[PDB]
Amino acid sequence: AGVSEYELPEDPKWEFPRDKLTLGKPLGEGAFGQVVMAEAVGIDKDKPKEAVTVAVKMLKDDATEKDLSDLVSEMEMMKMIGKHKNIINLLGACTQDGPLYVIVAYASKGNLREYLRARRPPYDINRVPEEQMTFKDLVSCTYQLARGMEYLASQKCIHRDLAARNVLVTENNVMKIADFGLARDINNIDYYKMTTNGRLPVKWMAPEALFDRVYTHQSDVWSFGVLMWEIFTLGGSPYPGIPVEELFKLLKEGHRMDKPANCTNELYMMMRDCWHAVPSQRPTFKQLVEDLDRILTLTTN
Protein backbone atom coordinates (compact mmCIF):
# COMPACT_ATOMS: atom_id res chain seq x y z
CA ALA A 1 0.00 0.00 0.00
CA GLY A 2 1.20 3.52 -0.90
CA VAL A 3 0.95 5.25 2.46
CA SER A 4 0.47 8.80 1.14
CA GLU A 5 -3.13 7.93 0.13
CA TYR A 6 -3.80 4.82 2.22
CA GLU A 7 -6.27 5.29 5.05
CA LEU A 8 -5.79 2.78 7.87
CA PRO A 9 -9.01 0.74 8.24
CA GLU A 10 -10.73 0.45 11.59
CA ASP A 11 -9.76 -2.62 13.63
CA PRO A 12 -11.72 -2.27 16.88
CA LYS A 13 -10.30 -5.36 18.59
CA TRP A 14 -6.85 -3.71 18.66
CA GLU A 15 -7.75 -0.02 18.93
CA PHE A 16 -6.83 1.84 22.11
CA PRO A 17 -8.31 5.27 22.97
CA ARG A 18 -5.88 8.17 22.70
CA ASP A 19 -7.30 9.82 25.84
CA LYS A 20 -6.22 6.79 27.91
CA LEU A 21 -2.56 6.96 26.80
CA THR A 22 -0.04 9.28 28.45
CA LEU A 23 3.30 9.40 26.62
CA GLY A 24 6.40 9.47 28.82
CA LYS A 25 10.17 9.38 28.53
CA PRO A 26 11.93 8.15 25.37
CA LEU A 27 13.20 4.57 25.29
CA GLY A 28 14.89 4.58 21.91
CA GLU A 29 15.36 6.35 18.61
CA GLY A 30 16.44 4.15 15.71
CA ALA A 31 16.11 5.77 12.31
CA PHE A 32 12.62 4.79 11.09
CA GLY A 33 10.78 5.16 14.40
CA GLN A 34 11.09 6.15 18.00
CA VAL A 35 9.83 4.36 21.09
CA VAL A 36 8.59 6.08 24.24
CA MET A 37 7.46 4.80 27.60
CA ALA A 38 3.79 5.47 28.31
CA GLU A 39 0.97 4.83 30.76
CA ALA A 40 -2.04 3.04 29.26
CA VAL A 41 -5.14 3.18 31.45
CA GLY A 42 -7.32 0.09 31.12
CA ILE A 43 -5.33 -1.76 28.46
CA ASP A 44 -5.41 -4.81 30.77
CA LYS A 45 -9.09 -5.83 30.67
CA ASP A 46 -8.62 -7.61 34.03
CA LYS A 47 -7.60 -4.34 35.77
CA PRO A 48 -9.71 -1.79 33.90
CA LYS A 49 -9.06 1.37 35.94
CA GLU A 50 -5.36 0.53 36.28
CA ALA A 51 -2.60 2.31 34.36
CA VAL A 52 0.08 -0.07 33.05
CA THR A 53 3.47 0.98 31.74
CA VAL A 54 3.87 0.23 28.01
CA ALA A 55 6.19 1.11 25.15
CA VAL A 56 4.80 3.08 22.20
CA LYS A 57 6.39 3.05 18.76
CA MET A 58 5.62 6.04 16.53
CA LEU A 59 7.04 8.04 13.66
CA LYS A 60 9.56 10.87 14.03
CA ASP A 61 8.94 14.39 12.68
CA ASP A 62 11.22 13.70 9.69
CA ALA A 63 9.59 10.34 8.86
CA THR A 64 9.57 9.07 5.27
CA GLU A 65 6.82 7.15 3.50
CA LYS A 66 8.81 3.95 4.00
CA ASP A 67 9.00 4.68 7.74
CA LEU A 68 5.19 4.79 7.89
CA SER A 69 4.87 1.68 5.70
CA ASP A 70 7.28 -0.15 8.03
CA LEU A 71 5.33 0.90 11.13
CA VAL A 72 2.05 -0.33 9.64
CA SER A 73 3.75 -3.54 8.51
CA GLU A 74 5.24 -4.14 11.96
CA MET A 75 1.80 -3.67 13.54
CA GLU A 76 0.09 -6.02 11.06
CA MET A 77 2.83 -8.64 11.39
CA MET A 78 2.45 -8.72 15.18
CA LYS A 79 -1.33 -9.07 14.83
CA MET A 80 -1.00 -12.13 12.63
CA ILE A 81 1.92 -13.70 14.54
CA GLY A 82 -0.10 -14.17 17.71
CA LYS A 83 1.11 -14.59 21.27
CA HIS A 84 4.27 -16.27 22.51
CA LYS A 85 6.31 -15.97 25.73
CA ASN A 86 9.46 -15.01 23.78
CA ILE A 87 7.87 -12.50 21.37
CA ILE A 88 7.32 -8.94 22.58
CA ASN A 89 3.57 -8.66 23.26
CA LEU A 90 1.40 -6.43 21.07
CA LEU A 91 -1.18 -4.68 23.29
CA GLY A 92 -2.97 -2.24 21.00
CA ALA A 93 -2.72 0.66 18.60
CA CYS A 94 -4.02 4.20 18.08
CA THR A 95 -4.67 4.24 14.33
CA GLN A 96 -7.63 6.58 13.66
CA ASP A 97 -7.69 10.39 13.63
CA GLY A 98 -4.05 11.06 14.50
CA PRO A 99 -0.50 9.69 14.54
CA LEU A 100 -0.08 5.94 14.41
CA TYR A 101 0.93 4.57 17.83
CA VAL A 102 1.81 0.88 18.11
CA ILE A 103 1.54 -0.10 21.78
CA VAL A 104 3.67 -2.99 22.99
CA ALA A 105 4.58 -4.50 26.36
CA TYR A 106 7.40 -2.70 28.16
CA ALA A 107 10.74 -4.53 28.64
CA SER A 108 12.38 -2.79 31.58
CA LYS A 109 15.90 -4.21 31.07
CA GLY A 110 16.24 -2.92 27.51
CA ASN A 111 17.95 -4.33 24.44
CA LEU A 112 19.89 -7.58 24.64
CA ARG A 113 23.28 -6.28 23.49
CA GLU A 114 23.51 -3.69 26.28
CA TYR A 115 22.01 -6.16 28.77
CA LEU A 116 24.84 -8.62 28.06
CA ARG A 117 27.58 -5.97 27.99
CA ALA A 118 26.43 -4.66 31.39
CA ARG A 119 26.70 -8.20 32.81
CA ARG A 120 30.18 -9.12 31.54
CA PRO A 121 32.81 -10.63 33.86
CA PRO A 122 35.40 -8.10 35.11
CA TYR A 123 35.07 2.57 33.06
CA ASP A 124 31.39 1.66 32.55
CA ILE A 125 28.76 3.26 34.83
CA ASN A 126 26.09 0.99 33.28
CA ARG A 127 27.43 -2.33 34.58
CA VAL A 128 25.26 -4.60 36.71
CA PRO A 129 27.76 -6.80 38.61
CA GLU A 130 25.11 -8.47 40.80
CA GLU A 131 23.62 -9.96 37.59
CA GLN A 132 26.80 -11.15 35.84
CA MET A 133 26.08 -13.80 33.22
CA THR A 134 26.89 -17.44 33.90
CA PHE A 135 27.28 -20.03 31.18
CA LYS A 136 23.86 -21.39 32.14
CA ASP A 137 22.40 -17.87 31.79
CA LEU A 138 23.81 -17.64 28.26
CA VAL A 139 22.43 -21.03 27.24
CA SER A 140 19.07 -20.11 28.75
CA CYS A 141 19.01 -16.86 26.76
CA THR A 142 19.75 -18.79 23.57
CA TYR A 143 17.11 -21.44 24.34
CA GLN A 144 14.40 -18.81 24.94
CA LEU A 145 15.22 -17.12 21.64
CA ALA A 146 15.17 -20.45 19.78
CA ARG A 147 11.71 -21.10 21.27
CA GLY A 148 10.50 -17.71 20.06
CA MET A 149 11.81 -18.40 16.56
CA GLU A 150 10.42 -21.94 16.52
CA TYR A 151 7.03 -20.37 17.23
CA LEU A 152 7.61 -17.65 14.62
CA ALA A 153 8.53 -20.23 11.99
CA SER A 154 5.48 -22.34 12.88
CA GLN A 155 3.37 -19.29 11.94
CA LYS A 156 5.11 -19.31 8.52
CA CYS A 157 6.69 -15.91 9.15
CA ILE A 158 10.30 -14.87 8.64
CA HIS A 159 11.81 -12.18 10.85
CA ARG A 160 14.71 -11.25 8.48
CA ASP A 161 16.39 -8.92 11.03
CA LEU A 162 17.28 -11.17 13.95
CA ALA A 163 20.08 -9.66 16.04
CA ALA A 164 20.84 -8.77 19.63
CA ARG A 165 19.74 -5.18 18.96
CA ASN A 166 16.23 -6.45 18.14
CA VAL A 167 15.84 -8.48 21.35
CA LEU A 168 14.41 -6.97 24.55
CA VAL A 169 14.77 -8.22 28.15
CA THR A 170 11.99 -7.93 30.76
CA GLU A 171 12.24 -7.26 34.49
CA ASN A 172 12.16 -11.05 35.03
CA ASN A 173 14.94 -11.63 32.43
CA VAL A 174 12.60 -13.05 29.78
CA MET A 175 13.95 -12.76 26.24
CA LYS A 176 11.55 -11.00 23.83
CA ILE A 177 12.09 -10.93 20.07
CA ALA A 178 11.06 -7.47 18.86
CA ASP A 179 11.23 -5.12 15.83
CA PHE A 180 9.02 -6.90 13.32
CA GLY A 181 9.21 -4.04 10.79
CA LEU A 182 11.07 -6.19 8.26
CA ALA A 183 9.23 -9.46 8.96
CA ARG A 184 7.20 -11.11 6.20
CA ASP A 185 4.45 -13.72 5.83
CA ILE A 186 5.63 -16.59 3.64
CA ASN A 187 2.58 -18.82 4.01
CA ASN A 188 1.79 -20.55 0.67
CA ILE A 189 5.07 -19.48 -1.01
CA ASP A 190 8.29 -21.43 -1.06
CA TYR A 191 10.58 -18.47 -0.38
CA TYR A 192 10.54 -14.68 -0.13
CA LYS A 193 12.13 -12.88 -3.08
CA MET A 194 14.60 -10.17 -2.06
CA THR A 195 15.10 -6.98 -4.04
CA THR A 196 18.49 -6.21 -5.60
CA ASN A 197 19.80 -4.33 -2.53
CA GLY A 198 17.94 -5.11 0.68
CA ARG A 199 17.52 -3.33 3.98
CA LEU A 200 18.90 -6.22 6.07
CA PRO A 201 22.16 -5.70 8.00
CA VAL A 202 24.73 -7.57 5.92
CA LYS A 203 26.59 -9.15 8.84
CA TRP A 204 23.45 -11.14 9.84
CA MET A 205 22.33 -12.08 6.28
CA ALA A 206 22.46 -15.65 5.01
CA PRO A 207 24.47 -16.09 1.78
CA GLU A 208 21.48 -17.30 -0.25
CA ALA A 209 19.82 -13.99 0.58
CA LEU A 210 23.01 -12.03 -0.23
CA PHE A 211 23.80 -13.78 -3.52
CA ASP A 212 20.63 -15.57 -4.71
CA ARG A 213 17.99 -13.09 -3.44
CA VAL A 214 16.01 -15.82 -1.60
CA TYR A 215 14.89 -15.84 2.05
CA THR A 216 13.41 -18.85 3.90
CA HIS A 217 13.11 -19.95 7.52
CA GLN A 218 16.59 -21.42 7.12
CA SER A 219 17.85 -17.90 6.36
CA ASP A 220 16.54 -16.86 9.78
CA VAL A 221 18.48 -19.88 11.14
CA TRP A 222 21.70 -18.37 9.75
CA SER A 223 20.93 -15.07 11.52
CA PHE A 224 20.20 -16.98 14.73
CA GLY A 225 23.74 -18.36 14.59
CA VAL A 226 25.13 -14.83 14.43
CA LEU A 227 22.80 -13.97 17.32
CA MET A 228 24.25 -16.90 19.28
CA TRP A 229 27.74 -15.56 18.66
CA GLU A 230 26.59 -12.14 19.96
CA ILE A 231 25.22 -13.85 23.07
CA PHE A 232 28.32 -15.88 23.85
CA THR A 233 30.59 -12.87 23.30
CA LEU A 234 28.34 -11.05 25.81
CA GLY A 235 27.21 -8.49 23.26
CA GLY A 236 30.15 -8.43 20.83
CA SER A 237 29.73 -7.24 17.27
CA PRO A 238 30.11 -9.86 14.52
CA TYR A 239 33.04 -10.27 12.10
CA PRO A 240 35.16 -7.87 14.20
CA GLY A 241 37.42 -5.71 12.09
CA ILE A 242 35.88 -6.91 8.80
CA PRO A 243 33.97 -4.14 6.96
CA VAL A 244 30.83 -5.27 5.19
CA GLU A 245 32.41 -4.40 1.82
CA GLU A 246 35.06 -7.09 2.38
CA LEU A 247 32.71 -9.64 3.99
CA PHE A 248 30.90 -10.53 0.73
CA LYS A 249 33.96 -12.18 -0.81
CA LEU A 250 35.05 -13.74 2.49
CA LEU A 251 31.64 -15.41 2.85
CA LYS A 252 31.91 -16.77 -0.70
CA GLU A 253 35.27 -18.26 0.27
CA GLY A 254 33.73 -20.01 3.31
CA HIS A 255 34.87 -17.59 6.03
CA ARG A 256 33.14 -18.10 9.39
CA MET A 257 33.59 -16.37 12.74
CA ASP A 258 35.91 -17.90 15.33
CA LYS A 259 34.77 -19.52 18.56
CA PRO A 260 33.83 -17.03 21.32
CA ALA A 261 35.89 -17.09 24.52
CA ASN A 262 33.01 -18.11 26.83
CA CYS A 263 31.75 -20.93 24.61
CA THR A 264 32.07 -24.73 24.61
CA ASN A 265 32.98 -26.49 21.36
CA GLU A 266 29.49 -28.02 21.52
CA LEU A 267 27.83 -24.60 21.35
CA TYR A 268 30.29 -23.30 18.72
CA MET A 269 29.54 -26.30 16.50
CA MET A 270 25.86 -25.42 16.83
CA MET A 271 26.70 -21.92 15.54
CA ARG A 272 28.70 -23.46 12.70
CA ASP A 273 25.78 -25.75 11.82
CA CYS A 274 23.55 -22.65 11.59
CA TRP A 275 26.12 -21.25 9.13
CA HIS A 276 26.13 -24.26 6.81
CA ALA A 277 26.47 -23.12 3.21
CA VAL A 278 23.47 -25.31 2.25
CA PRO A 279 20.28 -23.92 3.86
CA SER A 280 18.55 -27.30 4.13
CA GLN A 281 21.56 -28.70 6.04
CA ARG A 282 21.27 -26.09 8.78
CA PRO A 283 19.15 -27.22 11.74
CA THR A 284 15.54 -26.15 11.95
CA PHE A 285 14.41 -24.04 14.87
CA LYS A 286 12.59 -27.13 16.21
CA GLN A 287 15.92 -29.02 16.23
CA LEU A 288 17.79 -26.11 17.88
CA VAL A 289 15.14 -25.99 20.63
CA GLU A 290 15.53 -29.72 21.24
CA ASP A 291 19.33 -29.54 21.38
CA LEU A 292 19.44 -26.41 23.53
CA ASP A 293 16.90 -27.90 25.94
CA ARG A 294 19.08 -30.98 26.38
CA ILE A 295 22.19 -28.83 26.96
CA LEU A 296 20.27 -26.56 29.33
CA THR A 297 18.84 -29.51 31.28
CA LEU A 298 22.33 -30.99 31.73
CA THR A 299 23.71 -27.59 32.77
CA THR A 300 20.98 -26.85 35.33
CA ASN A 301 21.41 -30.53 36.48
Numbering used by the authors: 461 to 582, 588 to 766
Q: Could you pull the original sentences from the published paper?
A:
The FGFR subfamily of tyrosine kinases has emerged as an excellent model system to elucidate the molecular basis underlying allosteric regulation of RTKs in a physiologically relevant and unbiased fashion. Our data reveal two clusters of hydrophobic interactions, termed ‘DFG latch’ and ‘αC tether’, which relay allosteric signals between the A-loop and the molecular brake. These hydrophobic networks, located strategically at the interface between the N- and C-lobes of the kinase, sense the structural fluctuations in the A-loop and molecular brake and undergo rearrangements to determine the kinase interlobe angle and hence kinase activation.
The activities of all double mutants targeting different allosteric regions were higher than the individual mutants. In fact, the activity of the E565A/K659M double mutant nearly reached the maximal activity achieved by A-loop phosphorylated WT FGFR2K. Note that reminiscent of the A-loop phosphorylated activated FGFR2K, the molecular brake is completely disengaged in the unphosphorylated K659M/E565A double mutant. Note that the A-loop in the K659M/E565A double mutant is in an activated conformation. The hydrophobic interactions that the K659M mutation introduces to support the active conformation of the A-loop are represented by semitransparent surfaces, and the hydrogen bond between Y657 and R649 is shown as a red dashed line with the distance given in Å.
